[PDB]
């Protein structure tokens, strides 16, 4: 869900009509919104490169890519980069939304269990997410980076 809906939901459980204090929180979000939209466009354009750089930092030139490693074979390599893309796309969605919930509902739920059955290494995946965050931070610029970082960290903590 979204920051706006989150405020609404909090009021709805109370049963309270919308109040100025609530409105102020919504207003706060609205100011941040413009920045977020710009950041999202940057990420979308540079998505392929972001993944490439992050992979270079952590995934490739590693035991994983070497034979007997989890990311060995083309099929596994492709799967890992697909997962990386997912994380990036969802983080971008979360940043626009201003809420971490979407990450929980789609990405975070059942991922640990799936990975354990697959035998994918969680710590390495987390490493990759952190690497993406660093690359993203550069492109988006400082103001946007703080907002972007929290969602990346949320994914990492969940995993």
């Amino acid at each position: 869900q979204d920051a706006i809906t989150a405020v609404i939901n909090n009021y709805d459980v109370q049963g309270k009509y919308l109040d100025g204090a609530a409105l102020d929180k919504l207003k706060a979000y609205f100011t941040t919104g413009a920045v977020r939209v710009r950041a999202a466009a940057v990420i979308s354009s540079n998505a392929t490169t972001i993944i490439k750089e992050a992979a270079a930092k952590a995934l490739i030139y590693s035991d994983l890519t070497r034979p007997g490693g989890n990311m060995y074979t083309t099929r596994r390599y492709a799967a890992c980069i697909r997962d990386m893309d997912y994380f990036l796309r969802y983080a971008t969605y979360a940043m626009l939304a201003g809420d971490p919930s979407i990450l929980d509902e789609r990405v975070l739920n059942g991922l640990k269990e799936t990975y354990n059955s697959l035998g994918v290494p969680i710590a390495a995946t987390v490493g990759g997410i952190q690497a993406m965050k660093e690359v993203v931070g550069g492109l988006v610029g400082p103001d946007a980076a703080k907002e972007a970082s929290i969602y990346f960290d949320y994914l990492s903590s969940g995993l």
Binding site: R75, A78, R82, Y86, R106, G110, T114, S117, L118
Partner: protein
């Protein structure tokens, strides 16, 4: 009627999928007794591994 609760994981070996497809990979399901036999075989043929089988409904070794 007897029912089976089955948890099974199936990997997508033929093609990488852009869609998230979490549900297809890992699924817990209720199977009619008659259906389960065929379903079990189909999971095996796919190369999916059935982690857990339980009889959700009915009594084991019941004549009727």
């Amino acid at each position: 009627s007897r029912y089976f609760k089955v948890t099974a994981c199936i990997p997508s070996l033929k093609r990488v999928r852009t869609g998230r497809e979490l549900q297809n990979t890992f699924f817990t399901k209720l199977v009619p007794y008659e259906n389960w036999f065929t379903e079990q075989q189909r999971i095996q043929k796919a190369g999916g591994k059935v982690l857990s089988v339980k009889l959700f409904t009915g009594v084991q070794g019941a004549n009727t």
